[PDB]
A paper describes a structure:
Deoxyuridine 5'-triphosphate nucleotidohydrolase (dUTPase, EC 3.6.1.23) is a ubiquitous enzyme in DNA repair that plays a key role in preventing uracil from being incorporated into DNA. dUTPases are widespread in organisms, including eukaryotes, prokaryotes, and some viruses. On the one hand, it catalyzes the cleavage of dUTP into dUMP and pyrophosphate (PPi), which reduces the possibility that dUTP will be incorporated into DNA through DNA polymerase. Herein, we determine the crystal structures of ASFV dUTPase and swine dUTPase in both their ligand-free and ligand-bound forms. We observe that the swine enzyme employs a classical dUTPase architecture made up of three-subunit active sites, whereas the ASFV enzyme employs a novel two-subunit active site.
The prokaryotic expression of full-length swine dUTPase was difficult, so an N-terminal truncated form of sDUT (residues 54–221) was expressed. In contrast to ASFV dUTPase, swine dUTPase (sDUT) is a classical dUTPase. The α,β-bridging oxygen in dUTP was replaced by an imido group to form 2′-deoxyuridine 5′-(α,β-imido) triphosphate (dUPNPP), a nonhydrolyzable substrate analog and potent competitive inhibitor of dUTPase. The sDUT-dUPNPP-Mg2+ complex structure represents the prereaction state of the substrates just after binding to the active site. The swine dUTPase active site is inseparable from the trimer assembly as follows: one subunit provides catalytic motifs I, II, and IV; another subunit provides motif III; and another subunit provides motif V. In detail, as β12 is antiparallel to β3 and β7, the C-terminal β-strand (β13) is swapped to the adjacent subunits, and eventually, the C-terminal motif V reaches the active site opposite of its own subunit. For example, in swine dUTPase, the corresponding four amino acids are Cys, Glu, Arg, and Ile, and these motif IV–corresponding amino acids form a long β-strand (β12). The Arg193 at the end of β12 forms hydrogen bonds with an adjacent Arg193, and this rigid structure fixes the direction of subsequent amino acids, which ensures that the C-terminal β-strand (β13) is swapped into a neighboring subunit. Moreover, both Met99 of ASFV dUTPase and Gly167 of swine dUTPase offer main-chain oxygen and nitrogen atoms rather than side-chain atoms for hydrogen bonds with the uracil. There is 90% genetic similarity between swine dUTPase and human dUTPase, and their five conserved motifs were also consistent.
Author numbering:
A (entry chain A), B (entry chain A), C (entry chain A): 81 to 230
């Protein structure tokens, strides 16, 4: 229902939606950072958020910075009970420095709906058709897909 | 309920499920790409999608390509209102070239359920037990976990 | 509602919550691994899980390892029908070796709520205000955001 935030400084910007049904609110750097090639920066938003009940806040990469500048977002799990400064962990996999300026949109926050399950240790799980299958078990192409189901 | 898609070319493949309760529909490259070591490619699916109400489309990495070939997916946030070509941002962190061929399953699309909250600026948030705690505050092992809760 | 797990060895640890409303259960390595710079390891938890109905298990990076050690999690999509050993695909983008020890919390499992939609091929999708817009279409700063909506 409501995403609450408070400013921790004059340098913060209220997050904004790129489009009417955008998955995420864009997050603004409060500061300048130089991210050297193959290095990381923790970008302060200088906001604290209170996420609505039944989600967490996922810090996700924008596609523009990813495709154009080889920028990625690490970490990314903002918990419903976190009241600290929301930090964006930026990864520069590019060959050139990446310059963040105060007021640049360098990530997006998604209200990812989750269950908060109680954990239950059991001795044996039920079986499934997938079973232990993983790590490319279903193959690479359309034939492999359809072979797998026979 | 329904994931709608339309083909933007003869080169596209309808996405397929790896298993009965797979989280994602596998996405097929429509083209050949050579991804050099420590470089990226934007892989066209040549599909446009209309995601159901209450989710976005997350482009996620397959575990086979990740574990075997050090392949990763950047960006990944397909918005409910996006009607463009779904692009997969592929990252090759491996030492060898990675070859994508038309018809290779090189990612998966998950209908991630999200809230579309209205954003509300407040002066002060409520407090929590976690508070400002983050960035490894709870430590590395089982003792650290249980110490934290005392 | 319930996250079921079974131990596949004496070396496993039941996953634990970092905080009362943590998004994820922390996952413990069952073994020692040396992750060389710019290399990957598949870390065995030696647990199998049965995820509740209506989610998948996303293996997500912790922020401490990300910010301090340039550690990232690849792959990450644990399907509801998977009954195998949950593996964490760890990426070391740092300059130094990263040492995993048995009993280290090196990732977190989130019960990400998803739709399992039936897929429907159509000839034409409806139009939207975003349309084909993506890959940085809305720009870099607050002016660009507000220009875009005019
Ligand atoms: O990080 C991960 C990712 C996947 N897995 C396992 C469980 C999951 O259900 C299974 C398949 O995951 P993906 O569908 O994401 N990868 P891929 O498509 O390559 O495997 P498959 O061909 O078997 O579906 O691999 C892990 O153990 N750790
Ligand atoms: O990208 C991020 C990730 C996390 N955080 C903050 C908020 C989050 O609630 C808190 C802890 O996140 P994680 O649980 O994902 N990382 P870690 O387990 O290392 O921290 P902790 O030991 O405090 O739980 O760190 C950020 O500010 N930016
Ligand atoms: O992996 C992706 C990510 C995004 N996209 C497309 C669809 C999505 O709706 C659109 C915008 O995604 P983001 O909002 O995550 N990136 P960015 O903010 O840079 O683009 P924009 O300024 O247009 O919102 O780009 C892809 O095709 N593949
Ligand atoms: Mg955007
Ligand atoms: Mg799969
Ligand atoms: Mg944590």
């Amino acid at each position: 229902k409501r995403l609450r935030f408070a400013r921790l400084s004059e340098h913060a910007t209220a997050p904004t939606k790129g489009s009417e049904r955008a998955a995420g609110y864009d997050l603004y750097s409060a500061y300048d950072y130089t991210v050297l090639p193959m290095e990381k920066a923790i970008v302060k938003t200088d906001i604290q958020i209170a996420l609505p009940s039944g989600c967490y806040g996922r810090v996700a990469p924008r596609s523009g910075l990813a495709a154009k500048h080889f920028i990625d977002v690490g970490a990314g799990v903002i918990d419903e009970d976190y009241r600290g400064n929301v930090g964006v962990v930026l990864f520069n996999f590019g060959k050139e420095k990446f310059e963040v300026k105060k007021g640049d949109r360098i990530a997006q926050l998604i209200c990812e709906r989750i269950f908060y399950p109680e954990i239950e240790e059991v001795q044996v799980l039920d079986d499934t058709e997938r079973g232990s299958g993983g790590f490319g078990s279903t193959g690479t192409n359309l034939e492999h897909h359809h072979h797998h189901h026979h």
